[PDB]
């Protein structure tokens, strides 16, 4: 209830639809002109953001201290408008909740909200054959079209949807220290 209300407002204010050469994704703006995509969006020097051409000033593919994959790409966007600063809503470590909402904003799943239930700290996963850490797990059969999906609870942005195995979905944890 409060989680759906939080998610609708979060997506209204900070989400957009992005097309890269590698497909269509939900993109979350974090602060200033920094957004996050799943790494496998592989954003070029230019992106479509809500059907408009936008330049990518910088692109950091995130890895932990061992160089392990986190499956997140931070993007600096060449635009005048700035994102509402949502770093306050990002945890310092992986959040587990009994009740989460996954919010999608593409052409395929426009403004849809999925109650995914319990989110558990999964940690390690071989994702696309790349070892990956900091994975949050929910028992939902996620499909193509949901990557970049934003995983939320009341007052919390928990992570970005990056993968599934047909029965479970996995989000990369969106941790505060990524955006210092
Ligand atoms: C996402 O890009 C999208 N278009 O929505 C997509 C979401 C997937 C597709 C089917 N279910 C989902 O939630 N993500 C991917 O395709 C990522 C991408 C490539 C592989 N990948 C996967 O999620 C794969 N899973 C996987 O590696 N399976 C394990 C090994 C964990 C058993 C797969 C096989 C495409 C579903 C990369 C770069 C991680």
Numbering used by the authors: 1 to 180
What did the original publication write about this model?
The main protease (Mpro) of the betacoronavirus SARS-CoV-2 is an attractive target for the development of treatments for COVID-19. Starting from crystal structures of the Mpro in complexes with the Hepatitis C virus NS3/4A protease inhibitors boceprevir and telaprevir, we optimized the potency of the alpha-ketoamide boceprevir against the Mpro by replacing its P1 cyclobutyl moiety by a γ-lactam as a glutamine surrogate. In line with our original goal of identifying broad-spectrum inhibitors that target the main protease of coronaviruses and the 3C protease of enteroviruses, we also assessed the inhibitory potency of MG-78 against the Mpro of the alphacoronavirus HCoV NL63 and the 3Cpros of enterovirus A71 (EV-A71) and Coxsackievirus B3 (CVB3). Finally, coronavirus Mpros feature a catalytic dyad comprising a Cys…His pair, whereas enterovirus 3Cpros have a catalytic triad consisting of Cys…His…Glu(Asp).
Using 10 µM Dabcyl-KEALFQ↓GPPQFE(-Edans)-NH2 (↓ indicates the cleavage site) as a FRET substrate, we found IC50 values for MG-78 of 6.7 ± 2.2 μM against the EV-A71 3Cpro and 1.45 ± 0.40 μM against CVB3 3Cpro. Crystals of the EV-A71 3Cpro complex with MG-78 were grown in cubic space group P432 and yielded useful diffraction data extending to a Bragg spacing of 2.07 Å, whereas the CVB3 3Cpro complex gave crystals in space group C2 that diffracted to 1.65 Å. Compound MG-78 binds along the substrate-binding cleft in both proteases. Similar to the situation in the coronavirus Mpro, the nucleophilic attack of the catalytic residue (here Cys147) onto the α-keto group of the α-ketoamide warhead leads to the formation of a thiohemiketal, with a covalent bond between the sulfur of the catalytic Cys and the α-carbon. The amide oxygen of the warhead accepts hydrogen bonds from the Gly145, Gln146, and Cys147 amides of the oxyanion hole. The carbonyl of the γ-lactam accepts hydrogen bonds from His161 Nε2 and the side-chain hydroxyl of Thr142. In the CVB3 3Cpro structure, the contacts to Leu127 and Gly128 are more relaxed. Instead, there is a rather short distance to the Arg39 guanidinium group. The two nitrogens of the P4/P3 urea unit donate hydrogen bonds to the oxygen of Gly164 in the EV-A71 structure, whereas in the CVB3 protease, only one of these is strong enough to be called a hydrogen bond. Whereas the crystal structure of MG-78 in complex with the SARS-CoV-2 Mpro revealed an ideal fit, those of the complexes with CVB3 3Cpro and EV-A71 3Cpro demonstrated some steric incompatibilities that likely reduce the inhibitory potency. Such incompatibilities are more serious in the case of the EV-A71 3Cpro compared to the CVB3 3Cpro complex, in remarkable correlation with the inhibitory activities of MG-78 against the two proteases.
